[PDB]
Amino acid sequence: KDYVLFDINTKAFVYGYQTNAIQRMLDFDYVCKRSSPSISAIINPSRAGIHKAFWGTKEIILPMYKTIPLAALAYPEADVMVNFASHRSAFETTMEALKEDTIRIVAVIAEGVPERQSRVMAATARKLDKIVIGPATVGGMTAGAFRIGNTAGTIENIIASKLYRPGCVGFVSKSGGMLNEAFNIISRNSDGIYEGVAIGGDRYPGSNMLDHILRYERNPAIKMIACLGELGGEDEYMIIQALKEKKITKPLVAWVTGTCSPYLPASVQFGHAGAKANTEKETAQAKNDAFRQAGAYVPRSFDDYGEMVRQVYDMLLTRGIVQKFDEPEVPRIPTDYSKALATGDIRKPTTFICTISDDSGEELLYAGKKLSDVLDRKMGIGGVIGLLWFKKELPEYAAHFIELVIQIVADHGPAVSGAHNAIVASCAGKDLISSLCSGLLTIGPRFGGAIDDAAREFKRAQETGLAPEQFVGEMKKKGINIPGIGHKIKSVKNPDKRVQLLISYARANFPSTELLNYALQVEELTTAKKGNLILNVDGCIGILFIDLMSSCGAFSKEEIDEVVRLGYLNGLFALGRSIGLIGHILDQKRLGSRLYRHPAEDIAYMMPSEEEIQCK
Amino acid sequence: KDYVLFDINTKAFVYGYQTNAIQRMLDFDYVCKRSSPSISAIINPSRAGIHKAFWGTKEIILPMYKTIPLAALAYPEADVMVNFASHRSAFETTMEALKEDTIRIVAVIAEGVPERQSRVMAATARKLDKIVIGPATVGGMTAGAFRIGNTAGTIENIIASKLYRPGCVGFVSKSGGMLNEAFNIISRNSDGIYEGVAIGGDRYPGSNMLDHILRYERNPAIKMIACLGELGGEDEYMIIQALKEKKITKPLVAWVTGTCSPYLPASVQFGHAGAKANTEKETAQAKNDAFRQAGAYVPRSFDDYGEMVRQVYDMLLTRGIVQKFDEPEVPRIPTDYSKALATGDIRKPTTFICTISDDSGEELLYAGKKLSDVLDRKMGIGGVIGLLWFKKELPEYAAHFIELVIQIVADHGPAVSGAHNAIVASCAGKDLISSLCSGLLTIGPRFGGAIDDAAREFKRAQETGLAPEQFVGEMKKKGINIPGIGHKIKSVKNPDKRVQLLISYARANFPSTELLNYALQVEELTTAKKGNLILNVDGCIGILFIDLMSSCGAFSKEEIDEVVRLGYLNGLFALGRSIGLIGHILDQKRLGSRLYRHPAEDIAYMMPSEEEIQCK
Amino acid sequence: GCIGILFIDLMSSCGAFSKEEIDEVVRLGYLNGLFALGRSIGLIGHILDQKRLGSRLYRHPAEDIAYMMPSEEEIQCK
Numbered sequence A, B: 001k002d003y004v005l006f007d008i009n010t011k012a013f014v015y016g017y018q019t020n021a022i023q024r025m026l027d028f029d030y031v032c033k034r035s036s037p038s039i040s041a042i043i044n045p046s047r048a049g050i051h052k053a054f055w056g057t058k059e060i061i062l063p064m065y066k067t068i069p070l071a072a073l074a075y076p077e078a079d080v081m082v083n084f085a086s087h088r089s090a091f092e093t094t095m096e097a098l099k100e101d102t103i104r105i106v107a108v109i110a111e112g113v114p115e116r117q118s119r120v121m122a123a124t125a126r127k128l129d130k131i132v133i134g135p136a137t138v139g140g141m142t143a144g145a146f147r148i149g150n151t152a153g154t155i156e157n158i159i160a161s162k163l164y165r166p167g168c169v170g171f172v173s174k175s176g177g178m179l180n181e182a183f184n185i186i187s188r189n190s191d192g193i194y195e196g197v198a199i200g201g202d203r204y205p206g207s208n209m210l211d212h213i214l215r216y217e218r219n220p221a222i223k224m225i226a227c228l229g230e231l232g233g234e235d236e237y238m239i240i241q242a243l244k245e246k247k248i249t250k251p252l253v254a255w256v257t258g259t260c261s262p263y264l265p266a267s268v269q270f271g272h273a274g275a276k277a278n279t280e281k282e283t284a285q286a287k288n289d290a291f292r293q294a295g296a297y298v299p300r301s302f303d304d305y306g307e308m309v310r311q312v313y314d315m316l317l318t319r320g321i322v323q324k325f326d327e328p329e330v331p332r333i334p335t336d337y338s339k340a341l342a343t344g345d346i347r348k349p350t351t352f353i354c355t356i357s358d359d360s361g362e363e364l365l366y367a368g369k370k371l372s373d374v375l376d377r378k379m380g381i382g383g384v385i386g387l388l389w390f391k392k393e394l395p396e397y398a399a400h401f402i403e404l405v406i407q408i409v410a411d412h413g414p415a416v417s418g419a420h421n422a423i424v425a426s427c428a429g430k431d432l433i434s435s436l437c438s439g440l441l442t443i444g445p446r447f448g449g450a451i452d453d454a455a456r457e458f459k460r461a462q463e464t465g466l467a468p469e470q471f472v473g474e475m476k477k478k479g480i481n482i483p484g485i486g487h488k489i490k491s492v493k494n495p496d497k498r499v500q501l502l503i504s505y506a507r508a509n510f511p512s513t514e515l516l517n518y519a520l521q522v523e524e525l526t527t528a529k530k531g532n533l534i535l536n537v538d539g540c541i542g543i544l545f546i547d548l549m550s551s552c553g554a555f556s557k558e559e560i561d562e563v564v565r566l567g568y569l570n571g572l573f574a575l576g577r578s579i580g581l582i583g584h585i586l587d588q589k590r591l592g593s594r595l596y597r598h599p600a601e602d603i604a605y606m607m608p609s610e611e612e613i614q615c616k
Numbered sequence C: 001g002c003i004g005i006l007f008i009d010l011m012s013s014c015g016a017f018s019k020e021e022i023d024e025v026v027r028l029g030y031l032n033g034l035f036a037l038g039r040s041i042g043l044i045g046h047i048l049d050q051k052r053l054g055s056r057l058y059r060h061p062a063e064d065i066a067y068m069m070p071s072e073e074e075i076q077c078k
């Protein structure tokens, strides 16, 4: 019981939101034919909630807790914690898990944990009869029962190394990557591992190799012990002393890496924090020699490790210590979609097309132009709209016209429909965005819509060849006021400044103003009836926008008709009037304005009678 | 050349939106290493526009036209039309394509085309020196050059039958499915087909078998002819007469299916419209015998077809008529995502979870309950909300309470924020949906949100044990008016009917009204200050909804707190008040109401000074 | 991060805003408005782009949704 670290009933917490590691653990549980997942909960310090993962092809939900005590109280059956905290958090989180009465094993994955912190974790573990695997390890595994996080990599590797079923080998290493290579070596030269553990490469581990070797010595299922050490520190001398004191009776295969060291400078610090021979005793040579002399099976080099494994396994087969079992059913999990797509195994059709922007690359593109080029060239807001809406690099006069229109339509006081609705929502204590959309949703045929109608009606008259008099006459016959014509106060003698600013700019800077010249002929006729029948702001924008497009030269008659039809002009009004809408919402917020209720006397209540509401 | 039907430069129109058939054609062009796609445009009678498909792993755009004359004028280089119109439209569309000067070949896929219509198409084709393949065919193909729609199925089948490069065999059949089996037979017993055509199984085809056999006889690339006929009609007698008149000098393999017919009743009509032997001459026996006597290579049965093809191919090799080909590079296209997913080759994680409804199955489910069960049980609107919002089968008093609240809050006149904004949006000529949202976006802390506040504040006071006096006192100290308390006109002597209707129903029908009992103790205290400090409608809803949830018994204290926090109660107000909002919007539409502008005298303009707007 | 932080620096550079005035600007969501105004441009752009392309009605793919209906027992009131 004490010798068993993990079994098929082991339940664990995964500390840290490591979705791939979580999936790897579940995938192993599935291929091992486990009744339940090996994970009771995830500990996510940023967030409590749920996490969805696969159980084969079936999706399951795992609970997710902010703290170790909250998870432990909810899942007391979970006695293992897989700790993916960084080297900056590994100590505090391991110490907290070790203080929990229900947790027995903590696997510390982080590399770069101080030696002092590891010694304090190791001593805390020993005092409380608990186990710390790591720091700086992948963990380990019990074949066919449980895996620590990423131990033994892909499901393909688990299958190829026959890790879904136990063997007779008890394995322990310092290196994590070499633990996976060893799983492959051992499966090819024996019935495979029963259990494998990497203690990490730190000078002061949470648990020494001997701790695990002593558990393998007590386990009846294990008939063979195999270990892979390295230069630096005196850990392997605990094994050699135990081997000498007859504490390890099972045959032990042993190899210590770092035979390169005497050929190279004495100053060379190797990969693992603890891989540096300070004394001669700490060298790979002194260790391998002391292992040979203690009665362990030591190969000539790492190349003949598997062969020594093969020799020791064959000896157990002859003596009958190990019996030859039947290969269980080879398990199967479908390929992950993202792998199939990344390798080009599959092709997947796109649902959407996007021709205006691309955030996929090294740099954001607006209509194929890099954002840094848009800004280095001072294209301005008008230029950015040219790219994103018309897919054009507009000339300077066109981009400035767009920016002029935005300033001119920014606001027209609080009384208009849009500003009025935005103010009411703001007075109802709504946030800026809700209040803005409440205002924007009034923009249509009567508020902002005369821009499109003027562009539409004037373009058609001028195109179809109608003389201004004929257009004025036709519209009067149909009983339709000309869109873009008329003002309540402004007239020929008293002009609207917004109009004059727009017209003076186009006359001075537009290459062509053909629709404007026609519009001004129509205006001479309407002002001959009533002086206030001037070309208003909405008319001016729609008409000059057709002239801007005709001046660009890159738009056909059809393209221009499409621009009017699709409501690009309603968008320009919406974008500009957003400024004043946001302004009015914020203004009511600064003023601390109260809830609005329309005055009762401004409403004529005209209820239908009892007779009027009857069905007959 | 006249004998060539299709080559590697053939461009086509696909009449009918057959996305899979379009993809199949493009996939063949890709594996054949074609420079350009074999499709110039799609003809879609419902819609003009674009269609996106794959070119290997690269996505391309195909133009899409509403009519045949419009497509023909845009793409005059396209001389083939693949017609996927139904049997009800096949004639009119084929006739229109044949009248186009640029179209030479029309493949009619539809089954069930009248014999008169086919006769008229065939005669029209012969008069204009054009070709009609079909009706009731898949089409045919020139190996390594062009495929008609779905001819030869999957890309796996195209690869397995080596159809990506030509052979020496000129193939013609009546059957479409047997054309694909023949492609497989021939590839296994020769260098494969050069070209293959299925004329369809109709009694009066657009083109007879001999038309295609004569083309193969003129083509230098073809050294071998193979055909598969069937009983009924005298089509095969055109071949036998041409074989007798030495018009077919190339060796011809021939088999006529329908040898079963004399053993069965004379009344039996087989699959294909033309597969019924009216006379003895029309039988498979009379046809196979006349073929043998004419000098064709006729097998003993269909089983020996491949063997006959192998014999004729080998004879051409001995005489050096056929030269040995070197097998070109085997082409490769990735599997379609949907195939990989459907076969379980891949597993794909879902982005969303849905726990409230399911439209995937045989029948729509609301919280796992079939819609027909929801309606057969008369669960009502309140029951439907119970399922979709609370995931509960609510008791009758709870579901009726939800429906009562909806009626009570349906409207409160046009003057309130929500109705007021919807009316302004409707007066601006906006559609119902825009106008509705303009009004709904005012719903929050001051309009509708006193419901959620009354539930929250009263629940907390009553939970934490605060005596009503202590709650009234605490709120006064903080300077916070009690949410759900107070009315402008209604008082103790003159009550709000909406409140009275809600309180009376809860008192009479709720199992428990603990929070209402508390609220009434609070109300006695507030009305002791000012008579108008009554429990208002918003307070009533919030409080009674906590009591409803406590009466259900299936909600914990936490679940209830979650309901208050998530704003379920704002949703209920939104749902019910949408009725009156939609009502107001429609009312302004019926009245023909004009654009609203807020009166200028109702606004105090308080502009900052020049000094106030300066930055220091 | 860059926009929020530099906007506080812009206001401190103007000199006409007190610490309180600046806190009010952050509190009232002026910065959400600036984002809304700017991102409107690309939103209008994408809407018009789908209109030019003649894009069809979207329906989210069925396989991207995990349907997890509660049981008959789970929906009961007691």
Ligand SMILES: CC(C)(COP(=O)(O)OP(=O)(O)OC[C@H]1O[C@@H](n2cnc3c(N)ncnc32)[C@H](O)[C@@H]1OP(=O)(O)O)[C@@H](O)C(=O)NCCC(=O)NCCS
Pocket: A476, A480, A481, A482, A483, A485, A486, A526, A529, A530, A533
């Ligand atoms: C007769 C009278 C009522 C007419 O009213 P009015 O304000 O001048 O103008 P209307 O409302 O008819 O509009 C003028 C024209 O502009 C047109 N118009 C209005 N808005 C327009 C628009 N946006 N686009 C195009 N045309 C427009 C109208 O269709 C109308 O055209 P029409 O004159 O060809 O029919 C007014 O001029 C009057 O009171 N005159 C005094 C008469 C008098 O002194 N009599 C003796 C008393 S003793």
Ligand SMILES: CC(C)(COP(=O)(O)OP(=O)(O)OC[C@H]1O[C@@H](n2cnc3c(N)ncnc32)[C@H](O)[C@@H]1OP(=O)(O)O)[C@@H](O)C(=O)NCCC(=O)NCCS
Pocket: B476, B481, B482, B483, B485, B486, B526, B529, B530, B533
């Ligand atoms: C003195 C006077 C101005 C007070 O005004 P009022 O209308 O009675 O009431 P208030 O505005 O103070 O509100 C009454 C209480 O209801 C409370 N209240 C209001 N809305 C509340 C709500 N929604 N929930 C809970 N408490 C609420 C207030 O906090 C206040 O509490 P308090 O009395 O404990 O401080 C008024 O009563 C008056 O004019 N009296 C005449 C005095 C007189 O005749 N003098 C001699 C003239 S010669």
